[PDB]
Amino acid sequence: KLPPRVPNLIPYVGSFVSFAKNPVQFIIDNSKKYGDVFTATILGKEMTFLNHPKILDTFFKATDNELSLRDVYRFMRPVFGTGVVYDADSTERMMEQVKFVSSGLTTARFRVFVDIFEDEIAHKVKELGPEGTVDVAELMADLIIFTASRCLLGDEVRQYLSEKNLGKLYHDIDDGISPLSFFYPSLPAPKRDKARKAVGEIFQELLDKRREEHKKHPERLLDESKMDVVDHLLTQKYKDGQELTDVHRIGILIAGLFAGQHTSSITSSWTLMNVISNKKVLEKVRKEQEEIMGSDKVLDYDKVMKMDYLEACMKEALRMYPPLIMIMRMARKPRECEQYIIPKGNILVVSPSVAGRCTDTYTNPDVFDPERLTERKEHEKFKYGAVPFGAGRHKCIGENFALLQVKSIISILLRYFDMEYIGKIPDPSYTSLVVGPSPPTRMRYKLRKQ
């Protein structure tokens, strides 16, 4: 047969409400009811949910003629741009773009990023003062609105991030992208579109400056450690010889910068928060920190490689708060899963949010406990037991940059500060397309060298 169905409140609207209440809880409740698979009409979309690691093989290895991304995240267009990534001409033109960014994220560059991380957290401590309080959130995003910019675009950008308000414009973009937009791609959003244009120009500009810097400084091109994304773009040609257009450029910089900022700064928040609020942890971390930093007064890519425990904390925050709670693919052929046959036109959904709290994989899964990963190995149980980065053909290609970018920021931060958190770990907030713990998230901080 077809999968069971969430019986609807109404035709059309279907189950939008209890889904929208808590997207994840929804999927969990109904799993227990109707089993490993089940369909639910949500604002007129046929969304089948796959709900047990065992079965997620097919979802991830199917091809983009079988299971389309482009179909489903196409709505991102007004953000990224036209003919870009999910709105790109093809499966293969997307990939080719993806890789352009992922070339800005090489071992050579990573070494330079760690220096950038410092340079900025320095500039940042100034703004704070020896002690006070601050929304962790606001800070991660604010650190990360600066680091990434430089990491991918290069220090050239910083004069804009500073003088020209670029952060704010990012928010106008990034606060005009409801997850509703998925069900209504044409929901009018003028103030975003003004921002995305203003950005557009600047990103253009940027290239226009960067071109003259190649004429005046060609040697840059041979040196792997200044070859940022912008360059890779300015000096590459799709695999068939077709040139890239500045609008493909300007739009792929943003495609990245989007990928870069939010998911990370949210894991920066969720992780720290659980560390400075479990003393057995904040311990082990500072042991590792101090073992490693030794006589050194600043960070390096090798140090950060060795920050194993801390990574388990960030892994753990992802099992507790994966900021992409839902991975989606439209079906174009009909699909055989288990005994069922999911029909063409449906949308297939898989949740990390869920998979991280399944109970065969994880004991006391409401308990933040890096030892579940490092000693108990709970994530190795099933081959898709934990998937914060996705997997198969579309596995995140920022994984290592991410890990690098946070681990670095949290380390560097601890060093500077003794910090403690105020009241409980807030719950997730399901208001945005990237899911982060809910405001306010304040913490006391005071320094460590007079």
Ligand X SMILES: OC(Cn1cncn1)(Cn1cncn1)c1ccc(F)cc1F
**In angstroms, rounded to a whole number, what is the distance separating the alpha carbons of residues 358 and 36?**
12
Among ligand HEM, ligand X, none, what binds residue 48 when CB lies within 5 to 8 Å by partner kind?
none
Q: How far is CA 132 from CA 280, 412, 423, 439, 444, in A?
A: 24, 18, 16, 18, 6
Q: Which does 265 bind (CB under 5 to 8 A by kind): ligand X, ligand HEM, none?
A: none
d(CA 394, CA 104): 18
| Residue 105 beta carbon to ligand X: minimum distance, rounded to whole angstroms | 12
- Between 256 and 437, CB nearer to ligand X: 256
Phi, psi of 290, rounded to the nearest 5 degrees: -75, -40
How many angstroms separate the CA atoms of 421 and 134, rounded?
10
Pick from ligand HEM, ligand X, none: which does 258 bind, CB < 5 to 8 A by kind? ligand X
Between 401 and 430, whose beta carbon lies closer to ligand HEM?
Answer: 401
Of residues 75, 146, 203, 258, which one binds ligand X by CB under 6 A? Answer: 258
Please state the closest distance from residue 158 (CB atom) to ligand X, in A. 22
Nearer to ligand X, 256 or 356 (CB): 256
Sites of contact with ligand HEM (CB under 6 A): 69, 98, 101, 256, 259-260, 263-264, 267, 318, 322-324, 327, 388-390, 394, 396-398, 401-402
- Give me the phi and psi of 376, to 5 degrees please: -80, -20
Q: Of these partners, ligand HEM, ligand X, none, which one is at the site of residue 433 (CB under 5 to 8 Å by kind)?
A: ligand X
Among the residue ranges 6-14, 258-266, 272-280, 375-383, the one whose residues contact ligand X (CB under 6 A): 258-266
**Within 10 A of 446 (CB to CB), how many other CB atoms are there?**
14
Rounded to whole angstroms, the Cα distance separating 399 from 387 reads 11
324 binds ligand X (CB under 6 A): yes
**Contact pattern for ligand X over residues 149 through 178, marking x by CB under 6 A:** ------------------------------
Closest approach of ligand X to the CB of residue 182, in Å: 9
- Name which of 169 and 318 has its Cβ closer to ligand HEM: 318
Contacts of ligand X in 204-223 (CB under 6 A): none
**Residue 217: CB atoms within 10 Å:** 10
Closer by beta carbon to ligand X, 173 or else 276: 173
Answer yes or no whether residue 396 interacts with ligand X by CB under 6 A. Answer: yes
Would you count residue 433 as binding ligand X (CB under 6 A)? yes
Element counts in the chain: helices (H) and strands (E) = 18, 12
299 binds, among ligand HEM, ligand X, none (CB under 5 to 8 A by kind): none
Q: Quick one: 269 or 278, whose CB is closer to ligand X?
A: 269
* Of residues 53 and 256, the one with the C-beta less far from ligand X: 256
Q: Between 34 and 75, whose beta carbon lies closer to ligand HEM? A: 75
Closest separation in Å from C-beta 81 to ligand X: 11
Selected range binding ligand X among 203-211, 227-235, 256-264, 407-415, rule: CB under 6 A: 256-264
Strand order in the sheet with 442-447: 131-135, 442-447, 417-421
Under the binding rule (CB under 6 A), the answer on residue 266 touching ligand X is: no
Contact indicator for 282, 275 with CB cutoff of 8 Å: yes
Identify the residue among 6, 27, 37, 85 touching ligand X (CB under 6 A). Answer: 85
Choose from ligand HEM, ligand X, none: what does 388 bind? Cβ within 5-8 Å by kind.
ligand HEM
Count of CB atoms within 10 A of residue 296's CB?
9
3-class secondary structure per residue, 246-278:
HHHHHHHHHHHHHHHHHHHHHHHHHHHHHHCCC
Distances in Å between the Cα of 160 and the Cα atoms of 164, 165, 251, 415, 430 are 4, 7, 18, 29, 32
Instruction: Give the H/E segment covering residue 348.
Output: strand 347-350
Q: How far is the CB of 311 from ligand HEM (least distance, A)?
A: 12
Q: Binding ligand X by CB under 6 A: which of 51, 147, 263, 269?
A: 263
Please tell me the distance from the alpha carbon of residue 335 to that of residue 80, in angstroms, as a whole number: 30
State in angstroms the smallest separation of the CB of 229 from ligand HEM.
9
Residue 83 site contact among ligand X, ligand HEM, none (CB < 5 to 8 Å, cut-off depends on kind)? none
272 vs 137, 183, 314, 321, CA distance in Å?
10, 34, 9, 13
> Contact at 8 Å (CB) between 443 and 139?
no
Helix (H, G, I), strand (E, B) or coil at 176: coil
Measure the N-to-C terminal CA separation of the chain; round to a whole number of Å. Answer: 70
Q: Which stretches of the chain bind ligand X, using CB under 6 A?
A: 73, 85, 255-256, 258-259, 263, 324, 396, 398, 433
